[PDB]
Amino acid sequence: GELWGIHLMPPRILVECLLPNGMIVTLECLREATLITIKHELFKEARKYPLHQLLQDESSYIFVSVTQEAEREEFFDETRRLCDLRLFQPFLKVIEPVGNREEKILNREIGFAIGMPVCEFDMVKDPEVQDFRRNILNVCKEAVDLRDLNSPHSRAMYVYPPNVESSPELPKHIYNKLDKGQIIVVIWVIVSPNNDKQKYTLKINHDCVPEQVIAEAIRKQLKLCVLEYQGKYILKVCGCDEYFLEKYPLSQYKYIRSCIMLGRMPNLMLMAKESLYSQLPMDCFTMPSYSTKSLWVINSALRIKILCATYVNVNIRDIDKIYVRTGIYHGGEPLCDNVNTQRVPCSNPRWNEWLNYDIYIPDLPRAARLCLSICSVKGAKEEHCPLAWGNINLFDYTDTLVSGKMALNLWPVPHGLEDLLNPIGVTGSNPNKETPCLELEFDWFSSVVKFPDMSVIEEHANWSVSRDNELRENDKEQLKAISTRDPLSEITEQEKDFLWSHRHYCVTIPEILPKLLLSVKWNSRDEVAQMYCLVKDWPPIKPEQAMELLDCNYPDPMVRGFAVRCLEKYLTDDKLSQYLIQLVQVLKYEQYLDNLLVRFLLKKALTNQRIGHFFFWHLKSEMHNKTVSQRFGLLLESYCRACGMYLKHLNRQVEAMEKLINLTDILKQEKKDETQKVQMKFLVEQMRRPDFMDALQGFLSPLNPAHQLGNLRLEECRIMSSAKRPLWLNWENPDIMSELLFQNNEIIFKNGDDLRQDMLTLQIIRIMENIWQNQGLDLRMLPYGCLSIGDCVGLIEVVRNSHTIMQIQCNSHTLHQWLKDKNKGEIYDAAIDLFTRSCAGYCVATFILGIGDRHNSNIMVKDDGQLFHIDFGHFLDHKKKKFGYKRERVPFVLTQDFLIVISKGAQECTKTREFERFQEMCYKAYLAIRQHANLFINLFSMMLGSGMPELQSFDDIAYIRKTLALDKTEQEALEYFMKQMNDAHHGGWTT
Amino acid sequence: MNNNMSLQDAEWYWGDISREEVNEKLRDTADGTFLVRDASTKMHGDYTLTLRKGGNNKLIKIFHRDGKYGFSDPLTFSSVVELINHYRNESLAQYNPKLDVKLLYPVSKYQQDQVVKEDNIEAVGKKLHEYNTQFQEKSREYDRLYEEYTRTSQEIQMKRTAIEAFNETIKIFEEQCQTQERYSKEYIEKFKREGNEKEIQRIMHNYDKLKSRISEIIDSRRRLEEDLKKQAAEYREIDKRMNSIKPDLIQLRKTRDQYLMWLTQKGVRQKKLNEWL
Numbered sequence A: 001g002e003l004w005g006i007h008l009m010p011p012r013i014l015v016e017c018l019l020p021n022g023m024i025v026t027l028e029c030l031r032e033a034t035l036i037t038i039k040h041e042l043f044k045e046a047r048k049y050p051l052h053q054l055l056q057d058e059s060s061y062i063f064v065s066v067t068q069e070a071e072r073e074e075f076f077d078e079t080r081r082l083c084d085l086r087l088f089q090p091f092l093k094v095i096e097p098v099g100n101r102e103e104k105i106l107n108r109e110i111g112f113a114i115g116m117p118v119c120e121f122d123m124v125k126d127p128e129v130q131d132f133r134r135n136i137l138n139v140c141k142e143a144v145d146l147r148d149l150n151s152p153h154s155r156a157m158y159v160y161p162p163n164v165e166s167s168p169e170l171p172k173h174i175y176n177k178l179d180k181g182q183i184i185v186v187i188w189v190i191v192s193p194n195n196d197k198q199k200y201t202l203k204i205n206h207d208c209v210p211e212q213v214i215a216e217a218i219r220k221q222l223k224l225c226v227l228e229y230q231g232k233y234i235l236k237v238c239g240c241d242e243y244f245l246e247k248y249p250l251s252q253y254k255y256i257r258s259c260i261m262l263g264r265m266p267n268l269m270l271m272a273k274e275s276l277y278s279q280l281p282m283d284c285f286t287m288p289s290y291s292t293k294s295l296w297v298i299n300s301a302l303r304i305k306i307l308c309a310t311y312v313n314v315n316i317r318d319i320d321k322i323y324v325r326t327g328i329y330h331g332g333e334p335l336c337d338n339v340n341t342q343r344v345p346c347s348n349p350r351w352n353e354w355l356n357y358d359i360y361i362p363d364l365p366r367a368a369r370l371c372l373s374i375c376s377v378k379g380a381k382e383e384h385c386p387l388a389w390g391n392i393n394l395f396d397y398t399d400t401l402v403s404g405k406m407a408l409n410l411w412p413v414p415h416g417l418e419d420l421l422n423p424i425g426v427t428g429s430n431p432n433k434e435t436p437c438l439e440l441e442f443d444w445f446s447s448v449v450k451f452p453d454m455s456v457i458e459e460h461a462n463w464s465v466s467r468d469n470e471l472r473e474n475d476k477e478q479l480k481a482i483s484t485r486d487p488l489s490e491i492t493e494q495e496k497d498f499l500w501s502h503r504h505y506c507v508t509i510p511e512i513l514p515k516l517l518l519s520v521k522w523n524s525r526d527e528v529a530q531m532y533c534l535v536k537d538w539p540p541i542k543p544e545q546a547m548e549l550l551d552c553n554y555p556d557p558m559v560r561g562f563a564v565r566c567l568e569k570y571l572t573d574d575k576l577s578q579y580l581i582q583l584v585q586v587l588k589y590e591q592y593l594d595n596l597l598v599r600f601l602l603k604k605a606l607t608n609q610r611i612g613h614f615f616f617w618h619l620k621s622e623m624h625n626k627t628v629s630q631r632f633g634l635l636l637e638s639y640c641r642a643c644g645m646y647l648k649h650l651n652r653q654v655e656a657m658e659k660l661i662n663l664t665d666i667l668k669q670e671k672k673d674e675t676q677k678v679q680m681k682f683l684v685e686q687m688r689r690p691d692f693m694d695a696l697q698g699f700l701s702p703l704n705p706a707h708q709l710g711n712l713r714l715e716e717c718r719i720m721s722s723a724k725r726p727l728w729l730n731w732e733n734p735d736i737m738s739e740l741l742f743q744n745n746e747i748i749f750k751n752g753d754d755l756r757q758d759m760l761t762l763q764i765i766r767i768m769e770n771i772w773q774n775q776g777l778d779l780r781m782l783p784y785g786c787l788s789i790g791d792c793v794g795l796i797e798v799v800r801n802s803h804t805i806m807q808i809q810c811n812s813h814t815l816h817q818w819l820k821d822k823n824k825g826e827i828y829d830a831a832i833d834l835f836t837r838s839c840a841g842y843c844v845a846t847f848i849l850g851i852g853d854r855h856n857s858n859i860m861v862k863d864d865g866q867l868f869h870i871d872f873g874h875f876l877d878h879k880k881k882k883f884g885y886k887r888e889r890v891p892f893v894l895t896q897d898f899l900i901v902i903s904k905g906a907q908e909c910t911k912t913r914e915f916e917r918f919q920e921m922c923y924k925a926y927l928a929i930r931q932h933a934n935l936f937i938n939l940f941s942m943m944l945g946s947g948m949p950e951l952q953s954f955d956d957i958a959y960i961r962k963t964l965a966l967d968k969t970e971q972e973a974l975e976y977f978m979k980q981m982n983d984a985h986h987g988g989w990t991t
Numbered sequence B: 001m002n003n004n005m006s007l008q009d010a011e012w013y014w015g016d017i018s019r020e021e022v023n024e025k026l027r028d029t030a031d032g033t034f035l036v037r038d039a040s041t042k043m044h045g046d047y048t049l050t051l052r053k054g055g056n057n058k059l060i061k062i063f064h065r066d067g068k069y070g071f072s073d074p075l076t077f078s079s080v081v082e083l084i085n086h087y088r089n090e091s092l093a094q095y096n097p098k099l100d101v102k103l104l105y106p107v108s109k110y111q112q113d114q115v116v117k118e119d120n121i122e123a124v125g126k127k128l129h130e131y132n133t134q135f136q137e138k139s140r141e142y143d144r145l146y147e148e149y150t151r152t153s154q155e156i157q158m159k160r161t162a163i164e165a166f167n168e169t170i171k172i173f174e175e176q177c178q179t180q181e182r183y184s185k186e187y188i189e190k191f192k193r194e195g196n197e198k199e200i201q202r203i204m205h206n207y208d209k210l211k212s213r214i215s216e217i218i219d220s221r222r223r224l225e226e227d228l229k230k231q232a233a234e235y236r237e238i239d240k241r242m243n244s245i246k247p248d249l250i251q252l253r254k255t256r257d258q259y260l261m262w263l264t265q266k267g268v269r270q271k272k273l274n275e276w277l
């Protein structure tokens, strides 16, 4: 709320005013009023009260107060509204400001974006936290220097980066749409005194750099203008904040490439270079004010003492015993046998026993973790359940082995997890101290004990050998076979011993590194030492395959180092944008705050504002989550301090979203027993207010920063039918050329549903579409915008001119007949094609991912005939547990309604040439994705720590392995797909 | 007796089950626990032995050539049953000295025969309906408790920060007493000798008002402290209730799954299973 307790403050509100001479003055104010008028109203009345003579001029004083976030805040911007002040209580202390004003304003602007006050980081005792804050700044200032390598063109490349594809090479069906490899492009120019446009239709090669597009434009002294005024102008997309600034073939830009497939003409705009270059903020950077034995020398087995737990929340009636389960983990696999304490009564949780592990301390790998939990118990059939869990890194960030007594405040068990330990969960104590607290004791080895240096490791790796052959074709063929296994197909013990024996030949096939790493005995310093030397000189690999090495199965820092170095060399901003969700989530697996991946992502976010935008939002959406609060907050703090002017743009977005959260809250709690007619009236009455209009207008779309959101069309904004009360919002597109792209921007704001599952489903769909397109399959999907922006708060892009299947139907011919009206005449065939292609893609895509059952409301159709899906909700068949059967659903069944459309209204709708043509499209689509199975398995694997109940374990990702039939041959995989479609369509599949 | 049985009748033989099914039968089981499944069709080998060791699942391929089975060249066993029964008595150290254990505890496919000895299909099906209804019911009971839990956890968060915001307020209002004390020490002094009690009348009025305002604020956070203690207590109670449903949930799920297995291993129509569920 805007005040504490009350969601909205009354029009009139009394304010307590604390004066510098120790006087309290009550003042009558307005909720809209500013701080300048309050201060002038105050000293007007302060003349009545005692000791006024001691008061100075108003220019010497400032207002201070406490906020909702428990922070004492000084209000420098005295043109702020009282409701926008974010006050805890209606009181204002007037004092004289001292210290650095500039950095105080900046600290509060970071704090506002970040979700928490920046001074909460100041009072963190933990050295790792303060080291991260200082050391990360080196990355930040080093990043702003790439933004000045060629100023002010560097500034333009940063703020408006080229939105390009990964490859200049075009697929066949894109090129075949071009007239002999040429594209008709319209360039518009303005004469602002006359304020009207003159269009110039051009016909140039697709692979023309903006300069060849800028040269031809002037024609529509012959070569003199293209010699001098060539690099004097820049191209812009109409109705967009998307610019062409770098030397790329025109067709490689996403918009132009999009225009070809859609059949639309590219509307570019001519604009002066200097006109945008001077409009750029040129944001500068300022440094903030916050700027012995070896492990292999210890002749002892590992042991840890479990002392006691403060309490567990358990009913003494129902549970017989409690105990502590413990494990030494490298990633998700135990390094030795789990060790339990002796069972004790629920009332008194006290053990005081040394647990002994079958591991010699020298053999502890660098990434070794302690995983523990307090478990409960209930012939003698007994159930074991986790009450709370916690993980500890056995080495700290400075390579130091843990020692002596320590206290570990535990975490609640995630919903749905039944596993007694949680090796995937984050490490470290729960920030919430009012929490079950396990007290433990590690051995103390008369020193600071440190993990060996790389040079020490290399010497041992040589020693291990001291204690010729060629690679046969037989061996060379098994190595290829092993490397073709997917990332979840466990290698056998024969295969492990084979790979290890041939570790020196494995370099010849670099993509086998994930398998060789699984063949390493991680509880043996001899083998890990030998692996390190091989990893150091290992050939770089394709980014999609390197990402495999970033999930929770590969915690070793050298391995992760390698993976990040592959991304540094080969990951293009295009694909980085496409995988950003996973690269952010994968930060949750990282042992420490400072690591190579976080340095990579932050650098990328600070040198490319499109990446920065989504980097901010992905991190911010999870700030409510206490497992990641500190990490992401610290990360966000760094970004916001170094991103420059974009912080002001992000602030407006956050300010808009908070006010939408405010409004939807009130609707869900205080207005639940009101009808939608009145609920809407409340919404309008509250939106019409000046503070809401100024907040919800003139900001950038968080779904797409290139889309400016101007004035609200408030008469057309509506609450949707659902109980969570989604807001169907409508903005004007304020661009002076918006009519050529879109005049108005519609977005659904949802507060109550977790939109992370949909966000992932739409990402996968986008990637699937990319696969099919490059392989010559024109199956057009519609992965609309969807962004999670907080705890069950999100944004969904609205597709214009789209209708649900029920809307069409409310007879099984009316869908086909409806599409006929909207596409009357000869243009009818382009619709049936698009529908069939859309249907195939979505039929195959939904089957693979096992999304929730489709119905008339789930499925939508556009005017042109494009079919797409909405509200995915659950994937990987989450309705299979809580149910019985272990079979694979076909979510999207083609009823006769859909079959008629494909068959163009034919009688035998399953026995036409169009239906079989459709079938082969589904067969091609299915096998195309199967061939890229590793990519999808990898992406999902990075998402296990995310907190999404639909993927908590590798057993959940096993679903796509079963739908893509990976344990089978390619022939059998196709046969499996056919049978699933036949069983779902009751035999109507004409096999 | 044992060596002459078919592989098909072997308790530890599961046939065409997936690697993920194998994992769910081997989770948190003692070392020596094992089962055999068919190898994946796209690979060399006929069967995969899977066993527990040091808390991990070990996969060993069983190969076949000319009537002989084994883990590697040469193949010396006459049948899979012969191979398995050999390593139920001999340590696997004979094959690989690093994995030193025996195949001790078979995951029997006649496992559910212990729990359900009911020979009638319909009686097993109807008990599947009863165990499923019980499970669904408790699942929804646990679900509501989780909604309560999270909401309670979120409201506690708001209160905790509100306590800190109250403390901050009290600090400011107490420092306001300090400022008025340091400012009036000489200004009351001047009019103590000048005898101006009329001014003192309105300075003390202001000071008493400040003291009066502090009282309310301290009392308000005192009230919030009580609310918080009450809600934290609710939290721990919700947590207790959830910890009682969890064990019952696992058992109710395990029983349903084993009753589903008995009907599957008897091949009951995929449609009649769904009318029970």
Ligand SMILES: Nc1cc(O)cc(-c2nc(N3CCOCC3)c3oc4ncccc4c3n2)c1
Residues within 6 Å of the ligand: A748, A753, A758, A784, A786, A796, A797, A798, A799, A800, A802, A804, A870, A871, A872
């Ligand atoms: N929880 C959720 C998740 C999601 O990805 C999409 C939607 C969604 N998206 C829509 N879109 C997405 C883009 O196309 C236009 C509207 C919807 O339109 C509707 N009409 C009537 C009833 C419901 C809807 C509806 N629901 C809802």
